[PDB]
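Hey all, quick one. A colleague (J.T.) asked me to put the zinc ion job into the tracker so the inputs and the structure tokens live in one place instead of scattered across chat threads. No bug as far as I know, just bookkeeping. Sequence used:
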Amino acid sequence: EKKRIAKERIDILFSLAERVFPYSPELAKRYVELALLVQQKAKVKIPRKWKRRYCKKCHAFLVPGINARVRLRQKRMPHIVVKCLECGHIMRYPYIK
Amino acid sequence: QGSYQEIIGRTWIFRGAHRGRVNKKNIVWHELIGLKVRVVNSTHPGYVGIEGYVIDETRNMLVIAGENKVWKVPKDVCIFEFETWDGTKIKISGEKLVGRPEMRLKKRWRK
Ligand SMILES: [Zn+2]
């Protein structure tokens, strides 16, 4: 029953944080904290792509072009560059099709 | 200086985003972020009897938004009446979800 409310809970703030971060960096960041426990505490879905706009260094909601940066270049195993502009952290993420 | 004064009214993003099945057993066990509620009884000459759209939920706050103003009312300073997604009125004391939204998603203390 608790995993169940998490499914609905997690998906709601999740969509909220995304829609507001654009419109509200703090809020999305606030829920992000809420979504964080919901995910682990409630044992729900494991993060995978949100790493594209999330930071495992300082936890937050980053968006490429706004408070986030992503760069991908080919030429022998393409590699993507991701970094937190909040907590200037350098990260990488290869590309596999 | 605060986002509140900036995210006031966009209940829109709280609408086309907030639709989790709302229920008491799902109100203090849910993410307070868009759910609709009102401050019926509180200890604040400027928050009692007022209705707003929930926004913030932290160890020391629970915020609701309406018109061009926000509902600043901690969870332990008042009783929140959130409406069930089934058109049912929920009567719950902000004290249950007092500061710790996790406590509910992660059940009572672990021990
Ligand atoms: Zn960061």
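Adding what we noticed when we looked at it: DSSP finds three helices and six strands in chain B. Residues 1-111 of chain B form a domain with the SH3 type barrels. fold (CATH 2.30.30.210).
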